[PDB]
């Protein structure tokens, strides 16, 4: 259970950075799209996999840009980051059910 | 052991990193995005794990599939002490992603002014 706590701590350490920088990333630029993938989406996937593993939760989080209908790349990035956080809440609800 | 090292280096499990290295984990292990453990620890700010990876032969200038180096990702996240350690171990300040962005560029665009000044000095 210690490992799971360690995963939550890493996730929240990552999130504090991702949540502020996401507002500055232009998702429509080549570099911004790549940085979002490398530094936001990819770590999120690893955290979500580590969170779900010990509880049998096997889900694959995927970005949904169709739900971010904005011309401004900065607002797309903030919208996609919101999806990441929502997925965290979804997995946590599943875990709490398992534990209960 | 590579996937366990990538996970422990991202999460910040110092003990587990040391155990994995002592059991012969590949310091060059790569995730599905081209990241090495050092990419993930530098981005996260995990200093001691960064030092452990460097001491065990990590390429300080490895590129992930999106063209970012560990210096890029530390400059992005705002980890000044990491940036300084990477530079001391030969990190390339002129590394560019696939559209020409350097570590300085990322620091400037993302508002990490201290790092941007350090990288400009080094250039």
Author numbering:
A (entry chain B): 205 to 304
B (entry chain A): 16 to 138
What does the original paper state about this entry?
The bacterial human pathogen Helicobacter pylori produces a type IV secretion system (cagT4SS) to inject the oncoprotein CagA into gastric cells. While the composition of the pilus is unclear, CagI is present at the surface of the bacterium and required for pilus formation. Using Alpha Fold 2 and Small Angle X-ray scattering, it was found that CagI forms elongated dimers mediated by rod-shape N-terminal domains (CagIN) prolonged by globular C-terminal domains (CagIC). Three Designed Ankyrin Repeat Proteins (DARPins) K2, K5 and K8 selected against CagI interacted with CagIC with subnanomolar affinities.
